[PDB]
Amino acid sequence: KNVVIYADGVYDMLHLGHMKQLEQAKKLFENTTLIVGVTSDNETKLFKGQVVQTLEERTETLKHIRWVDEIISPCPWVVTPEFLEKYKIDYVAHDDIYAWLKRAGKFKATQRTEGVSTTDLIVRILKNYED
Amino acid sequence: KNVVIYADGVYDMLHLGHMKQLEQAKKLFENTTLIVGVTSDNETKLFKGQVVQTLEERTETLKHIRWVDEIISPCPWVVTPEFLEKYKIDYVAHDDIYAWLKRAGKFKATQRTEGVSTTDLIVRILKNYED
Prior knowledge:
Structural class of chain A: alpha/beta
CATH superfamily of chain A: HUPs
Strand content of chain A: 15-25%
CATH topology of chain A: Rossmann fold
Number of helices of chain A: 6
Keywords: Transferase, CCT
Assembly: dimeric
Number of domains of chain A: 1
Entry title: Crystal structure of C-terminal catalytic domain of Plasmodium falciparum CTP:phosphocholine cytidylyltransferase with 1-cyclopropylmethanamine
Oligomer: homodimer
Strand order of the largest sheet of chain A: 3-2-1-4-5
Order of helices and strands of chain A: EHEHHEHEHEH
PDB class: transferase
Chains A, B: choline-phosphate cytidylyltransferase
């Protein structure tokens, strides 16, 4: 009755927004294994343009999160059907290139989540010292 | 065979340092319940002088951490023997006012942990834009 869920992302400077999203992926069914994929530094740099924490810091941080059952670090940038087969993944959690996942019934959307980001924290601190 | 461990702190802007410390408290024995106490805003302000995240943000964040089994939010600023009795706490994890805990065999130290703090992240980002 166990359902394997895969979610991938950069997970740079992880915050409540990411944690709630991982919670939602984990709770898509009563019995899950949540596998989390953490993109490589060189691919995040090239395809997003920047990355702050190394692959090791981003993976080490996710390890402490309650909902994460397994980590693939680094993961592939693009999910393929062979990847889904090789790891026995039943669904991919995401918040088009993803049309083949929806067409196979393997796409699960995770509603949007606001968190207290590093930016929010800096802004909140500096509001105390200048307008 | 279950051992109840209590750790209290502010847990402002939680990072890897805090997560590793909570891991260490959780793993002090093979079978534990880790209870975590989160200090109140007004007491943290008065006794530490400042606090960034509210009690709700600090508690909500700890809820997502793998090692945390129960949260007392807000917790008392000072641990008393009645508090230990009331919650059936066998040990207090900490990194003098704590001499009575050591004298009773209820004090467990958690070695020091370095993390990638918010400050470290800001500094690392700004090193890219100015010396």
